[PDB]
Amino acid sequence: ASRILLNNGAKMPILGLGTWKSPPGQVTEAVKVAIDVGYRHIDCAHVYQNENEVGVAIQEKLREQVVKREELFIVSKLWCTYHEKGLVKGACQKTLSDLKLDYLDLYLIHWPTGFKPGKEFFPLDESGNVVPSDTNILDTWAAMEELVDEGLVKAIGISNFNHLQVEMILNKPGLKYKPAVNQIECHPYLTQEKLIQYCQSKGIVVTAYSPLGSPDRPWAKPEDPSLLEDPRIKAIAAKHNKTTAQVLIRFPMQRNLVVIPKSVTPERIAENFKVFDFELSSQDMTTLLSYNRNWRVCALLSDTSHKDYPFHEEF
Ligand SMILES: NC(=O)c1ccc[n+]([C@@H]2O[C@H](COP(=O)([O-])OP(=O)(O)OC[C@H]3O[C@@H](n4cnc5c(N)ncnc54)[C@H](OP(=O)(O)O)[C@@H]3O)[C@@H](O)[C@H]2O)c1
Ligand SMILES: O=C(O)Cn1ccc(=O)n(Cc2nc3cc(Cl)ccc3s2)c1=O
């Protein structure tokens, strides 16, 4: 299928467009091209500082009668500096206003960690440590629940939560909505078998981010492993007469995951969509999973001491 069923009864397209690091100057066109070749899910975030430009793309294609809103699946994320209960609605309404939407299909707690509230997205002390806020996961969740109850969002979830932090919400006394989705880093070098096992066994859909290894991540090192340049994957792709990326995208799809590859390059936006016309074999799958090195690209070492930092646990 092209969409997966969420616990709120809605269907989420398994392929969406990533927008982290998509420059404002270029993401409007990115989103317009994506919608034209068939993407219906867009992954956004206030912290990406481009939601206005996404918004412009979406409104235009609506008005062009290319798509209707009910066909779109728009995701955004509550940033760490807005975890306080009194800050959540405003944060959501800023995103809705930027995107020019009257609701979000899915809204996620971006990271489990709260940061000191203020203008700066990554507030630092004088020694380079990120300054936390005195917020906890459960209170933030209750604020997320309100947004559903108020019709601002159809569904809520989490992102970058380890299985203990997921359990905390699941077991929350007086829980109103279970998380629909957990959006985590996932690719052949970080295959997340245990967390995916956990999440799926709980009826929680897993979305795979940085499926191509985020080669444009601002802290990349030349010596870092590169999925897109991996000769082993290239060979699997050539066998299927597909590109390396196409394979890297088809891989999470065959694990019953949602996947959200990012591009602002029109030809790669279309390339990345052409993944519904082939299947990776059982061996292929097995082979890609064996490349796991539990290697992640998205972490924040300056925040490792946070009580809620997620990657100290095994999964
Ligand atoms: N929840 C979170 O904490 C979190 C964290 C990280 C990412 N995510 C989400 O996941 C999305 C995807 O992850 P990502 O942006 O980190 O990286 P990604 O999708 O793994 O890779 C994006 C990089 O790959 C390039 N690229 C795209 N298609 C290509 C192709 N067919 N061939 C060769 N290169 C290609 C892009 O180049 P161009 O764009 O220049 O073409 C860009 O430099 C993000 O944009 C964001 O929406 C969520
Ligand atoms: O947030 C995004 O979607 C993209 N993104 C942007 C900047 C960046 O440094 N990172 C790494 C982070 N790691 C943590 C780790 C934790 Cl515990 C909290 C926040 C972050 S941010 C990043 O993933």
Side-chain angles (χ1 to χ4, degrees):
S2 64
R3 312 201 293 170
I4 178 150
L5 177 70
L6 299 179
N7 49 225
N8 71 340
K11 309 282 233 150
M12 171 175 193
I14 69 176
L15 186 60
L17 184 70
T19 58
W20 176 39
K21 308 172 265 58
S22 297
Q26 307 165 226
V27 71
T28 292
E29 196 57 42
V31 174
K32 284 165 45 186
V33 167
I35 293 169
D36 292 341
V37 308
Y39 295 64
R40 297 292 179 267
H41 158 206
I42 321 283
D43 181 76
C44 308
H46 177 59
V47 73
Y48 304 163
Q49 298 173 253
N50 66 180
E51 282 190 319
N52 272 296
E53 290 83 2
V54 179
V56 162
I58 292 170
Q59 174 171 257
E60 218 233 286
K61 288 290 161 172
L62 283 169
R63 291 198 305 125
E64 281 189 11
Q65 294 193 260
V66 181
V67 286
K68 310 163 291 257
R69 178 66 187 89
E70 324 88 52
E71 317 176 317
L72 292 186
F73 201 100
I74 316 299
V75 186
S76 188
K77 315 188 200 74
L78 179 80
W79 180 246
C80 303
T81 55
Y82 311 91
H83 274 215
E84 276 83 6
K85 302 204 96 225
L87 297 188
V88 165
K89 185 173 176 187
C92 186
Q93 298 198 121
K94 168 61 173 163
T95 278
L96 283 166
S97 164
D98 286 356
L99 296 169
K100 304 109 178 60
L101 301 178
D102 52 5
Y103 71 97
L104 298 169
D105 293 89
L106 179 62
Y107 197 52
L108 305 179
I109 309 175
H110 204 150
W111 296 85
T113 54
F115 298 175
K116 172 210 169 304
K119 264 271 109 151
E120 248 276 7
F121 291 144
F122 303 78
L124 299 181
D125 61 25
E126 299 79 3
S127 291
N129 308 295
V130 61
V131 191
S133 57
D134 180 38
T135 57
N136 56 266
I137 292 167
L138 294 177
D139 291 357
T140 306
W141 187 245
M144 298 286 283
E145 289 185 324
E146 275 220 317
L147 312 171
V148 179
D149 283 354
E150 286 167 325
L152 278 306
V153 306
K154 283 184 69 189
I156 51 178
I158 61 208
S159 185
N160 301 291
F161 281 41
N162 70 38
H163 91 287
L164 294 183
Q165 304 166 313
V166 171
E167 213 211 342
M168 272 249 50
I169 285 173
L170 289 204
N171 293 346
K172 175 189 200 156
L175 190 61
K176 306 284 153 225
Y177 299 96
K178 285 182 52 174
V181 167
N182 188 180
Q183 186 185 112
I184 62 177
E185 195 182 325
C186 186
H187 50 252
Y189 303 157
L190 180 78
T191 50
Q192 302 271 23
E193 280 171 36
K194 290 184 186 68
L195 185 53
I196 295 170
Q197 205 266 275
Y198 177 80
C199 287
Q200 290 182 155
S201 79
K202 298 323 216 183
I204 294 164
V205 173
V206 178
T207 294
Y209 80 58
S210 314
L212 313 190
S214 203
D216 47 341
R217 67 198 184 281
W219 53 88
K221 299 179 312 291
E223 68 268 12
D224 283 344
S226 180
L227 282 166
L228 277 163
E229 286 294 312
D230 190 321
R232 308 166 293 172
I233 310 183
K234 290 172 103 121
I236 289 174
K239 172 171 67 142
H240 292 273
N241 209 238
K242 307 294 285 188
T243 62
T244 292
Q246 281 168 326
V247 159
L248 287 167
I249 296 152
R250 181 70 195 191
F251 177 43
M253 288 166 85
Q254 293 193 210
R255 303 176 70 193
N256 308 165
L257 308 175
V258 175
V259 66
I260 50 170
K262 173 254 181 197
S263 177
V264 286
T265 306
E267 199 267 351
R268 290 158 167 178
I269 292 167
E271 166 181 324
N272 294 354
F273 201 75
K274 262 155 229 168
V275 291
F276 299 95
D277 57 347
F278 82 114
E279 163 127 286
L280 290 168
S281 83
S282 182
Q283 194 55 74
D284 285 341
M285 292 305 286
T286 289
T287 293
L288 290 161
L289 286 162
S290 78
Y291 296 157
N292 182 53
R293 278 216 111 202
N294 298 308
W295 186 80
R296 47 176 89 249
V297 297
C298 296
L300 181 72
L301 271 271
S302 66
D303 190 42
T304 40
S305 237
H306 212 282
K307 73 180 139 100
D308 298 319
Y309 189 85
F311 303 140
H312 297 315
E313 282 287 311
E314 174 161 41
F315 72 97

